[PDB]
Nucleic acid binder design. Structure first.
Length: 204
DNA sequence: CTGTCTATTGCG
DNA sequence: TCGCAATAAGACA
């Protein structure tokens, strides 16, 4: 519980390394063995009026009844499995927060990526934190303020950039997700896979 | 009626 | 290799 605090205007997150190399390797191995990713029609989204396969693999796990929707795609959560419960329980232990849902994004290499968005779901519990736990290759994670994007922005607030390491936890606390977009940009020189888990408190 | 704010490619 | 600008339109609300 030594945390790096990430502060900017309307930005309140914190970052720590939860697990040492050997433990994070074991957890990564088990994630690779056990996680089942969506394919085909459940891996296409619509943005700007055009449909695309997502440039990564995704999976959702959580309590019965929950659903998760973004960009024209609805995902239903698979029942919890031991490796995800273990990570969930550790994260809750260390933060005092609870979660009933996890979105998993796997980036096979640096060309897999995710575009800019806020985690402002309707189904998301108002004011609840999001716990982002990473395994595998380090990848750069980028926060941009809502008012600073476009050719002429309302304001020019500085972008915030963090490398997210193997075994790390990034807590995204209110009001981070009302004011800041985030993304995981392409990093061509990264050749190895990364699995990210974002634990959330969803409304049934 | 008003009026929307979102994955890839094409530059530089 | 990288980050930014440009990118439908109609079914909502």
């Amino acid at each position: 519980h030594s945390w790096r605090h990430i502060r900017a205007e309307g930005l309140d997150s914190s970052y720590t390394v939860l697990f040492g190399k050997a433990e994070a390797d074991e957890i990564f191995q088990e994630l690779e063995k056990e996680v089942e990713y969506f394919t085909g029609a459940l891996a296409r989204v619509q943005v700007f009026g055009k449909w695309h396969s997502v440039p990564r693999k995704q999976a959702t796990y959580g309590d019965a009844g929950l659903t998760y929707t973004f960009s024209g795609l609805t995902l239903s959560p698979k029942p919890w499995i031991p490796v995800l419960e273990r990570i969930r329980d550790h994260v809750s232990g260390v933060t005092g927060q609870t979660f009933n849902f996890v979105l998993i994004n796997r980036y096979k290499d640096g060309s897999d990526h995710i575009g800019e968005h806020r985690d402002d779901c309707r189904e998301l519990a108002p004011g609840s934190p999001i716990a982002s736990v990473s395994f595998g290759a380090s990848r750069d994670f980028v926060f941009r303020h809502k008012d600073s994007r476009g050719k002429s922005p309302s304001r020019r607030v500085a972008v915030v950039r963090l490398p997210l390491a193997h075994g790390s936890l990034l807590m995204m606390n209110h009001p981070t997700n009302t004011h800041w977009y985030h993304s995981l940009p392409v990093r061509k020189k990264v050749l190895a896979p990364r699995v990210n888990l974002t634990f959330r408190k969803i409304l049934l």
